[PDB]
Structures are given as C-alpha cells and as structure tokens.
Design a protein around this ligand. Structure first.
Ligand SMILES: Cc1cc2nc3c(=O)[nH]c(=O)nc-3n(C[C@H](O)[C@H](O)[C@H](O)COP(=O)(O)O)c2cc1C
Ligand SMILES: Cc1cc2nc3c(=O)[nH]c(=O)nc-3n(C[C@H](O)[C@H](O)[C@H](O)COP(=O)(O)O)c2cc1C
Ligand SMILES: Cc1cc2nc3c(=O)[nH]c(=O)nc-3n(C[C@H](O)[C@H](O)[C@H](O)COP(=O)(O)O)c2cc1C
Ligand SMILES: Cc1cc2nc3c(=O)[nH]c(=O)nc-3n(C[C@H](O)[C@H](O)[C@H](O)COP(=O)(O)O)c2cc1C
Lengths: 311, 311, 311, 311
C-alpha cells in the first residue's frame, strides 16, 4: 500500500500537489481534495491578495516549465478560511503554504494559522524559496535570513511545520541549510525542492523571452529539475534524519516518484506535470508507482524510502 | 560571418569546447584544434596530475549528463607545455582552464602561465565553479573566497583572463557575483555556466545512483541546464558590461547557441553535446547558427548578441 | 483557436494520442478522454484479446522508443463496448483503431463496428502498418494487400474511416500508396505515420538488444522519426487532396505539432512523448502550439496547415 | 587489433567513409586516403559528371542530417581514373561507388571498371539505394529491378562487388531483399544502409523545408537512423551468411561502430558524422572502439561480430 503516517496524519498515498499548482482557488482546492492525491497544499499566500507578476508569467515547455507567477493568491484570509471551514479533512490532510514577503508578515500569518492548525490539523508549509517575487530573493538562500524566519515562525507558530526549500547546488549549502533546519524541532518536514530559480527560456523565432516578469527570469520546473530535486531530497534526507523530507521536482511518472522516494521522499509533490495533466495525474502516478513497487517486491513505501543504492 | 575578435584575438566562430570535454589528453586538444571550432579550452587542471573521482564518474542521460569527474587532468605542466609548445595558435585561440583546489595553487599556476600567455597568447579560464572535487565547494558560490581568488590570480597573472562561473539561481547572487567580478579589470570574460552542481540521477531499475563519486552527486549538463545557462549568460551580460560573457550549457544546436548569443554570449562552449557527438558538432552548430542568421537577416553575431527581446 | 471541424466532428484541438499509447484499458481511455486532448484513439485491437509479444517489448531511449508490443489489446469486444457504452462523446471524438491480423478479421470487426459508429460517431482507424506482429508484415507495404483490405473494409464498413499508414521512404511508394488510398472515398483520413518498422536498438554494455520480441526488432518512435513523419504527412497531404492527413511521429513540442500541421496534418497524434510524459503533454502541446501561432499571427490551424514553404 | 581481412584485402581497421561523404574530389579522396580509416569509397558516380540537385541540398541537424545531393559527382572517368592512377593502394583499399541512373549506365561503367578492378583491386560498391535523384526511386526497393541490376552488373563486371542497400523496415522486405541478393555470388558484401529515404525537415521559424530539392524530401542520416541501420546490418548479416555486411548509419562513436559490428558489420562507414567532423573522426572512432573492446576483453572484431545478444 502507498499509505503512510506522517506528522500525526494518515496519507492514502504520498502524492499531493506542489504548492502553487491547482490550489489557488476554492475550486482548485476542491478539485485537489477530490483527486486521489494523498494530500494537498494551498497556493503560497501572503497577508493580502496578490495579482502576481504580469503575464505571460507561466510557460509550459518540452522539458517542463518556466514561471514567474509572483505569488498570485487569494490572500491568507481565504486559504486560512479554506483550511478552517471549507476543507474536508476526512478526505485528506491539508497543507497550507505561506509566503509572506517579510518575516513579520509570515509571523503575523502563522499566529493566525496556529489556532486553526491546532484545531483542524492543517499543516503549515513555510515557503522560503519563492524565486519569482521581484526584489525578494529566495530567503532560504540566505542562511541567517532563513535561520531568523524559522526562529520567528517557530516562536509565533509553536506547532509542527515544514519548509519549502529552494534547490541547492553546493554540498556546503546542503550542509549549512540542513544545519539551520535542524536547529528547529518544529520544522518536521522540508519540501525539496522549489523551482530552480531564475532560469531563462528564450524563443529563438521571436528572439524573445517567453515570460514577462523579471526580463524572462523565472523558476524552472518539470523534467529540467529532476536530478536536482532528487539530489536535494536525498541530501536533506541524509542531513535531516529527525525530519521528513517531502520530494518535489520533475515528477511525471510513478518512476520519477519512485526515485524521489528512493531518494528519501515521504510525500511526493507534483508541480509542472500536474499543471499540464490535471488532478487525474495522481491516479496515474499511484498506479505507476504501484506497478513498480510490484515488480520490485515492495509492499510499503518505507521498504524503499531513502534506500537509493550508491556505488 | 561567424567571426569575432575578442580578447585581442580572432576567432573563426564563437564555438569551442566546454572546459573538460575533449581537451584532457594531447590527442583531445589536437582533436579540438583540428575541429572547426573557433577556439578550444583545455581540461581544468590542477598543479599536479589528477586521477579524478572513482568511475563510473560520467553518465550521459536523455536530457544531458551528470558527472563527478573530480578534475582528472594530466597536470598543469602538460597543459602549460601544450600551451607553450604543442598548440598551433595559427589554427585557433587556446584557452587554458586552471582549477587549483586552493588560491595558492592557482597563484602557483597562473604565475607559471603568465610568461606563456604573454608570448603565445594562450587565454586563461580560471575555474571557480568545479562542483565535483570532494570537500571543495564551488568557489564562486563564496563571494568573499571568489574575491580572494580573483585578486590573487589577477595579481599573480597580471594579464587578461576569464572565469568559469557556476550557475546562480538567485537574483541577489547574480548582482553580488557581478559585483565581485566587476572589481577585477583583468577578468575580461566570464563563462556561464559550469555544470549545475550536485544533481542526483538515480536509475529506477537498479535503484542506484548512476555515478560512483559523492554518493551519486555530480554536475548536470545538457538539455537540463539550458534555461539556467541562458539566464546566467544574460544575467552577467547585463551586469558585467565591460566584460565578455562566454555562454556554456545546453548547446546541442545552432539554435541553442543562437539563444546563448541572443542572451549575451560571445563565445559559445559545448559540453555534453560534444561529449556525445565528437568535434563534428562544431561544423553543425556553425552551419545551423548561420542558417538561423541567414533567415533572420543577420550577417554578424554582433548584430543579435545580447539582443534577446524582453516583454 | 486550435479548434477544428473534421469528419463531421468537432475537435477542441488537433491533438490526440497515437493509437496504442495510453488507450489499452478502460482507465487509459478514461484518462485520455479526461485529458485536454482534442480526441483519442483506442489501442489497435484484434477480434479477441492478445497478450502481445514477450517482454521486455518497449524501451524508451534518448531519441524516442522502440517496441514490439505485438498488438496487446483487450480484444475488439471491449473497445467496441467502450465506443458503444463507456466513452462520453460530449468530451471528445473517439477513434477506434482496428488491427485484425487478416482481412477477414478486420471485415468481421468493422461489420460490428459499423452500427456503433453509425449511432455514436466513433471513427474507425484501420491499422495497416503494425510492424510488430511476428509473421504479419505491414499490410500497407504490400499495395495489392492494402488495396484488398480497403476494398473489404470499405465494403463491409461502408462508413467513413481512416488508415494508420506505415512510413514510406520511396517517392514511388508515396505515389502508389496514395494512388491506392484515393480509390477509396470512404478513406476520409490517413494517419502518417505508424512506427518506423523493425529498427534495432542494441545496448553497448550488455551487447544485447533492448527488447525481446523478434530478436530485438521493433518499431521506432519519437525523435528518430519526426523527419520521416513530416515527409509522409506531407507526401500524402499532397497526394490525397480529398482526404485528411493525421500527423503522427516525433511530436514532443507544440513546434513539432506545428511542423506536422505545417506539413499538412489536421489531427496530430502523440505516441512516444505521451508514453513518457502522460496526458499532461496535450495541455503543454496546446499551449506551445498556440504560443507559436501567436508569434506567427495565426488565429487558426487552417491558416498554416500544409503551408510548409519549399525552396 | 582492429585489423580485418575481407574481399581479399587487408584493412587496418573496419572504418571507412560512407559513399558520398568526403570522397567526391581528388582532394577528398586524398584526405580519406591520408586519414586513419581502413579504407575509403568514392562518391557514387554516374557515367557523366553531375552537378547534383539544387542547393541547399544538405542540412546538418541536431540528430544527423537530411540531404538530396542528387549524386553530384565528377563523373565515372575521374573516379575510374582515381582508382586506376591516383589512389595509393599501399595506404588502404579503395571502394569505388557506382550509381548509374539506369541498368545500362551501370553496365557501361562496371565494364570499364572491371579491368581496373582486376588490376588495382579497387572494390565496386554498386549503389542501388540513392533516394535523391528526381524521378529515380531506390532501385533496391524494386526487388525485380534490383535483381535485373545485379544480373547485368554481375555479368558485365564478373568480379566481386557489393551493393549499397537502402534501409528496409519490413521483415518480408529483409527476407526478399536477401532473397534477391543471395542469388548473386559476386555480391560479396552489402552495405547497410544508405540514407533513410525521403524524410522531411521543416524549420518551424521559416516554416520552410531546409533543403531545396524535391520539396524538401531528402535522405536522413546521422543519429536518426542508427537503430534502423543496426536492424538492416543484422537482418542482412543473418540473411546473407555467405556475404559480408558493411554497416553504415548513425556512427558517431566507437560505441556505435561497436553496435554495428555487434550487429554483424565487418566494415563500418561513417557519413553524417564524418561530414561534420572531418577525417579526424576515424582516429577517434578507432580509439573509442578499441577502448570498448579493451574493457570487454575483445582482442579482435571477429570475436564480437554479429555476436549481438537477443533476449
Ligand atoms: C505555476 C507555478 C506556481 C507555483 N507556485 C508555488 C508557490 O505558490 N509556492 C511554492 O512553494 N511553490 C510553488 N511552485 C513551485 C512548485 O511547488 C515546485 O517547487 C516546482 O514547480 C518544482 O516541481 P515540479 O518540477 O513538479 O514542477 C509553483 C510552480 C509553478 C509551476
Ligand atoms: C566530462 C565532464 C568534464 C567536465 N570538466 C570540466 C572542467 O574541467 N572545467 C570546467 O570548467 N567545466 C567542466 N565540465 C563542465 C562543462 O564544461 C560544462 O560547463 C557543463 O557540461 C555544462 O555545459 P553542457 O550543458 O554543454 O554540458 C565538465 C563536464 C563534463 C561532462
Ligand atoms: C507502446 C507503443 C504501442 C503502440 N501501439 C499501436 C497500435 O496499437 N496501433 C497503431 O496504429 N500504432 C501503435 N503505435 C504506433 C504509434 O501510434 C505511433 O504511430 C508511433 O509511436 C510513432 O509516433 P511517436 O513518434 O509519437 O511515438 C504504438 C507505439 C508504441 C509507442
Ligand atoms: C552528403 C551526403 C552524400 C552522400 N552520398 C552518398 C553516395 O553518393 N553514395 C551512397 O551510397 N550513399 C551516400 N550517402 C549516404 C551515406 O553513404 C550513408 O549511407 C548515410 O548517410 C547514412 O550513414 P550516416 O548515418 O553515418 O550518415 C550520402 C549522405 C550524405 C550525408
């Protein structure tokens, strides 16, 4: 079975959407809850509604996707209200991603989320890796900034929560990031990873960048970022032994999800692939993941999670 | 024509091999020199010869490659010897990529290199972004270290040279890296970019990592990193106006090379693609680039360099 | 818009799945129907259920895929049942691919399919190009054989239908195949092309073929055959002016579909790319094709279909 | 050793250029002779000089090439004059590729070539698979015409010779083609394969075919056709046991050449790759093939020729 118990919650399966994909509106959330996904995470929100960056801000490309959405969301209020009143937790666990543009904006939000998570069970995913807000660089790329955010969020939230991490490409950054992460016992999970910040897709024909925000610089997702995502899931799975690592990046197949789990992933989030395929992808991913586990003789996810064989 | 005059040199075309690919042995260099490439850069060398990391250390994958070569080179002595005696400069400009594991080591090399560069015109490409030497994190990810390396190298070299840059994925990082690079007038060119550091490719069937070194972590190249290379080439093209930007990454066609140049690249280096196709690729890339320039009405690379239109 | 009216049916977009890919089970079909694809075609079926050829029988390779599936299907009964009862035609047009191993079998099937198509509008795609059934060479390669199959089908079916054509690599064959197809007015569409037959993928390390059937000979699909697919789509688009030409082969991007449509394709089918990416590919393809039409100022597909420019 | 004895000739290695690539002018021939290739083949020639088809007629694409050269050759006289007076047989065996547009043209040539072949040892490669001469279909796709061509050629030549075969994609075709081939004992070798006929490359940007001849239809070469080439090499390796099969198609590395030999190739020709890389590729291919044989413990090609393992 693909079931698993994480953060005092039961998950039909490890699949769920990657924050920002089909989880902005009540309808996306209701669809995600309706899908066969093991859980769902709401759009990374801020205090007030955000129109996001100017369009075109998302482009589906052959190897995945580039995007500079710019945290377009219906506002914390809505998502908190969804978590507190609209979500049917009998259906599946809900993760509410937050992404205040300042540590105090995040603190202000988690204080309000606290009583709801306390009462509802909604799980907080602190997004410290948005690479698409102009003027706002991935917070988790600034280690002390991240350290502060977590001290401030831990303090004001006082409940278990996770952090959506930006991909790191330096072994030292793997070490340091995990060092920071491990100083916070409330950080029960880290989601690896967020879009590979600030890629640039150029259309040769038009000789123009494909997205409008930040001169075409946006987060890369999809096939492009799989090896990078697996590295981070694994790097942090090893470094953060007392925490759960949620895999995210380049998942299109049960095989991809399998490598993620093999890499140490508990939950496996699907961004780009979901963006293009729709919630139906989860049933497919689950079947695919099961066909594989079948072949390999794995009855449970635990049997092979983080069991990637090295040479 | 695809001819460009850069760094007091004439290049037949903007194409060349990426440091490390087909440029380790004397035969690779002779092979690169014989190729139709506008130039060639040698394998990143250390003072002493290096066996590199344990094999398998390079894996070609559908979307490029992952490698943890570990700077396997024949030693500075050889490459400086090739630079000073073996390379036929009448054929094409030669770049000597130096990748000391310490600032002292690089200073020891660039010191012995200077006289040669002075007479032969060999161009120095300082590698401040190798992501595969165990315990040696990408120097260019450490802005202060990068600065120390640049002033020590600039000082001991006293000649124009370039830097092989690591891909950055944070706007603040492009700005700070440029801030560091721009302090040194001798740094005439920055090559963007080196392998996307510490990806992890897992074979679902064997449930094992494809490469042996560092538990499967290696630099990614090819398709995967194209948007990341264009972003970086463009990021530093804009930020380092007084410097040339050599594009490297994801180049398989003249279209890719077109995007790189459109982004700001002067020279375009081919890594993975060359690794899997042989030097014949340069002829193709050149025909292809010319076919694109022909259609768009471009007679010179200068006409469309850095001319990537934004929305 | 990508909409288009073909064979008295409305198609949301030109995109669909290549027969045999994600369309063998009821779940595959419901998955394709749920996708953003403008239509779907069921697995080439035979009178009774087939287990197909010995596995491994499919191999995704860097440049596409090879496969000797061997017409593994749930039997004609199932797919007619799907056509007649399961498929929601409000969603999108359904094509039912038939691939009897003899003319009598196809006739027996189409006779039963007729009443269904007659009432539901399910479209027949006669597969005269399967290159994986041991002992059964592609029908469309024996022109007299093809002429007979079409006489019998046209006669026994009496309704408009299409033919999945094998790739031809001889101008004489384009002429003759077309000459043959054009004798059958019921042949409203010809899908170019089926897999490039009997290619052989050999693994260097194992020094063994990658698939088990027919000593490793299987149909190639994907990147490998795009040029070949455009040729056929174009050759037949030119030769069968009274018929529609459905493109298929090497479609991974909206640009590939664009070439197909530019070559003369009405519907564009995705096989290998879909096999590996999942139904999400259609949304991506649609977005990519639209962005291209956008840049080129095309409001409709009919604006650039078969408008490939020659020199 | 890469050395092999064939057709009563000694070959340093199995490599040679593909007919048409680097072998049209006296200088090309001199380059191929100078190269480290074990043998060379002259451009397919016709009795009289041919300008070939209108340019552009050859396009190097990311997966190989497309071409409609139209047999541009310096005429049989020159080539016969090369084989009789200019070639240095002390360097490497010479194959003279003949491609008459009529059976009488081929007979006219082989008659005159016979004496020179009797004296100099030049080997005849009858091209029965050109797919780029307007109005002239691949002769070998016409089993009877092919039969007639070989009766006439075998009669007028009376000496050992080979045939440049077009790739087949139908098992029955392999069987029949072999059936026709096997009748002639003088046909000591069949070169598999020639270009994959009449692929269509269209440039999405210009929306135009890349080559001018035949509305863009040209032979496909390079990476595209490797699997097809290995298939044909192996198909004819098994079907024509008393004949040598020279492999040709998709060779870029010693690994590819290794696959061809594995498949059953005695000699391995390089076309597209050579077209882009130059005669230097042969040294590279020989090094690479030896490096593979080194690891597999193969001391000779004979040890692994046609030893491809099937599942
Ligand atoms: C349209 C778009 C919007 C996204 N919005 C968010 C966001 O709100 N918060 C967040 O943590 N991640 C967001 N993501 C990033 C994904 O959650 C994920 O980190 C990234 O897409 C890589 O996963 P993938 O390859 O599965 O696409 C977004 C991604 C895309 C495609
Ligand atoms: C075989 C292997 C060796 C490499 N060696 C070096 C090197 O010595 N110095 C360097 O700066 N980059 C080295 N690289 C990185 C490449 O130079 C190039 O930056 C990277 O592959 C991205 O380019 P690509 O996408 O074209 O492959 C190496 C890459 C690989 C595949
Ligand atoms: C797994 C596999 C199964 C297929 N089954 C069928 C089939 O049943 N009937 C048919 O006409 N084509 C079948 N095809 C051929 C494809 O429909 C398609 O024509 C071919 O794959 C070329 O397109 P592609 O490059 O998009 O893969 C199959 C292909 C593959 C990949
Ligand atoms: C420029 C060009 C010219 C060619 N000329 C001939 C030739 O005249 N005779 C011939 O039999 N094949 C000719 N071919 C086909 C090649 O010999 C070879 O069979 C085909 O290109 C596939 O091999 P490859 O993948 O290594 O390119 C030519 C191909 C190209 C690229």
């Amino acid at each position: 079975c693909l079931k698993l118990n994480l953060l005092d919650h039961v998950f039909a399966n490890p699949f769920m959407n990657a924050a920002g994909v089909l989880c902005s509106t009540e309808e996306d959330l209701r669809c995600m809850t309706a899908s066969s996904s093991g859980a769902l995470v709401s759009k990374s929100c801020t205090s007030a509604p955000r129109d996001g960056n100017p369009e075109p801000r998302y482009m589906a490309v052959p190897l995945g996707s580039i995007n500079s959405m710019g945290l377009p969301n219906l506002g914390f209020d809505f998502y908190l209200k969804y978590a507190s009143d609209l979500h049917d937790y009998s259906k599946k666990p809900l993760f509410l991603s937050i992404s205040g543009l300042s540590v105090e904006e995040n603190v202000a939000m988690v204080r309000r989320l606290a009583p709801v998570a306390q009462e509802k069970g909604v799980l907080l995913e602190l997004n410290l890796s948005c690479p698409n807000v102009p003027g706002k660089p991935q917070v988790a790329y600034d280690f002390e900034a991240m350290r502060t955010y977590l001290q401030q969020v831990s303090l004001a939230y006082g409940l278990p929560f996770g952090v959506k991490m930006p991909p790191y490409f330096d072994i030292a950054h793997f070490d340091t990031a995990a060092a920071v992460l491990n100083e916070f016992p409330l950080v029960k999970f880290v989601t690896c990873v967020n879009s590979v910040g600030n890629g640039l897709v150029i259309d040769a024909e038009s000789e123009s960048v494909v997205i409008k925000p930040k001169q075409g610089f946006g987060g890369l997702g999809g096939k492009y970022i799989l090896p990078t995502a697996l590295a981070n899931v694994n790097a942090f799975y090893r470094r953060c032994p007392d925490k759960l690592v949620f895999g995210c990046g380049g998942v299109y197949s049960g095989e991809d999800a399998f490598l993620h789990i093999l890499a140490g992933a508990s939950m496996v989030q699907v961004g780009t692939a979901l963006q293009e395929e729709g919630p139906g992808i989860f049933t497919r991913l689950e079947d695919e993941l099961l066909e594989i586990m079948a072949r390999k003789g794995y009855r449970t996810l635990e049997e092979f999670r983080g069991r990637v064989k090295t040479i």
